[PDB]
Each structure stands twice: as structure tokens, then as C-alpha cells.
């Protein structure tokens, strides 16, 4: 299926999630298409240096250019996983009637209310904590996606 990760800038959390999940998915043998976008993103932007360094440590390349979320992306996605509950709210105010496909990453994976907080402006250690937080969620996501018919 088509999965999109969404954050604010599409510079830290969602690009990290996309790169981490693509790696996990290919190991697990998952047949999914993965993208990321931001609710307040510019195009041509890049992943922040700390996000790049955090993934580089785990031998994953984060070569990323920022993309704004658009109606076209929202229509075509099978699943939209937002970092925060506020991101869900923005998605609902700016785009079409797609509530049924939009969930926070924590909601969808763990069943509980929870946000993946913005690491932007934080130290490399803040980013590495975000990376680890994402990794654990995304490993579970992979296992869960196996339970989806027509995956």
C-alpha cells in the first residue's frame, strides 16, 4: 500500500520515519510504498544536519528534499501517519474528507494517545532519542502491516 508520514517541516521526524521504515520494510519483506510530507513545509528543503547524522550513525542515508502535503498526496495515500494529534487537526482543516485514513503514529501502532515531539532546534542527543523512539514504533508497524489483507 501507500503510506505517508507527516510532520511540520518535513525536515526531521517524517523524513527520519520514512528512511527508517523503508529500511525495516525491505528487511521484513514488506511490499509498501513510503513517502513523507509536511503541513508547513517548503519544497527544496533538506533534512536537518542532526537528523542526517542520527541516521548516518545507524548506516542509513537520509538524502531528503522537503515536500508540502497536497490534496493529491492525501487522496492517493492508503494510510497517513502524523507525528502529533495537532498534525491530524491541521490535516483536517487544510485538506479533504480523509479522517478515516489519518492517525497519529502512536495511535495506530500502540492504540494509545501520544505524540512524537518535535526535535527541531535540539541537540544531536535529542535527535537520537527521536530516532530511537521512531525505530521502535516503526518496527511494530511493520509487524502489524503483515496483518493487512491486500498488502
UniProtKB/Swiss-Prot annotation:
Keyword Cytoplasm attached: no
EC number: 3.9.1.2
Top-level division of the source organism's lineage: Bacteria
Regulation: Efficiently inhibited by Cu(2+) ion, Zn(2+) ion, sodium pyrophosphate and N-ethylmaleimide, while the addition of Mg(2+), Ca(2+) or Fe(3+) ions has minimal effect. Inhibited in a competitive manner by vanadate.
Key word Ion transport present: no
Binding site for substrate: 8-13
Database matches in Gene3D superfamilies: 3.40.50.2300
Disruption phenotype: Cellular protein arginine phosphorylation is only detectable in a ywlE mutant and not in the wild-type strain, and global gene expression is significantly impacted in the mutant strain. Cells lacking this gene are impaired in dephosphorylating McsB-P. They also show a reduced resistance to ethanol stress.
Upregulating conditions: Expression is up-regulated in the exponential phase of growth, followed by a significant and gradual reduction in the stationary/sporulation phase. Is not up-regulated during ethanol stress.
Site (described: Important for substrate discrimination): 11
Reaction equation(s) it catalyzes: N(omega)-phospho-L-arginyl-[protein] + H2O = L-arginyl-[protein] + phosphate
Result after altering residue 13 to K: Completely loss of phosphatase activity
A family per Pfam: LMWPc
pH relationship of activity: Optimum pH is 5.5 with pNPP as substrate.
Active-site residues (renumbered): 7, 13, 118
Alphabetic keyword roster: Hydrolase, Protein phosphatase
UniProt-listed CDD domains: LMWPAP (cd16344)
Effect of residue 118 to A: Completely loss of phosphatase activity
GO molecular function: protein arginine phosphatase activity; protein tyrosine phosphatase activity
Function in brief: Catalyzes the specific dephosphorylation of phosphoarginine residues in a large number of proteins. Counteracts the protein arginine kinase McsB in vivo. Can dephosphorylate CtsR-P; thus, can restore the DNA-binding ability of the CtsR repressor by reversing the McsB-mediated phosphorylation. Is the only active pArg phosphatase present in B.subtilis. Exhibits almost no activity against pSer, pThr, or pTyr peptides. Appears to play a role in B.subtilis stress resistance.
Family according to the record: Belongs to the low molecular weight phosphotyrosine protein phosphatase family.
Identification of the protein by name: Protein-arginine-phosphatase
Amino acid at each position: 500500500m501507500d503510506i505517508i508520514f507527516v510532520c511540520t517541516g518535513n525536515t526531521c521526524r517524517s523524513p527520519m520515519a520514512e528512511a527508517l521504515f523503508k529500511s525495516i520494510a525491505e528487511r521484513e519483506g514488506l511490499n509498501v510504498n513510503v513517502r513523507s510530507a509536511g503541513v508547513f513545509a517548503s519544497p527544496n528543503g533538506k533534512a536537518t544536519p542532526h537528523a542526517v547524522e542520527a541516521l548516518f550513525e545507524k548506516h542509513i542515508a537520509l538524502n531528503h528534499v522537503s515536500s508540502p502535503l497536497t490534496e493529491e498526496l492525501m487522496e492517493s495515500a492508503d494510510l497517513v501517519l502524523a507525528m502529533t494529534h495537532q498534525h491530524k487537526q491541521i490535516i483536517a482543516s487544510q485538506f479533504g474528507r480523509y479522517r478515516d485514513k489519518v492517525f497519529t503514529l502512536k495511535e495506530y501502532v500502540t492504540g494509545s494517545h501520544g505524540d512524537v515531539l518535535d526535535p527541531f532546534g535540539g541537540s544531536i542527543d535529542i535527535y537520537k532519542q527521536t530516532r530511537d523512539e521512531l525505530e521502535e514504533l516503526l518496527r511494530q508497524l511493520a509487524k502489524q502491516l503483515k496483518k493487512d489483507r491486500r498488502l
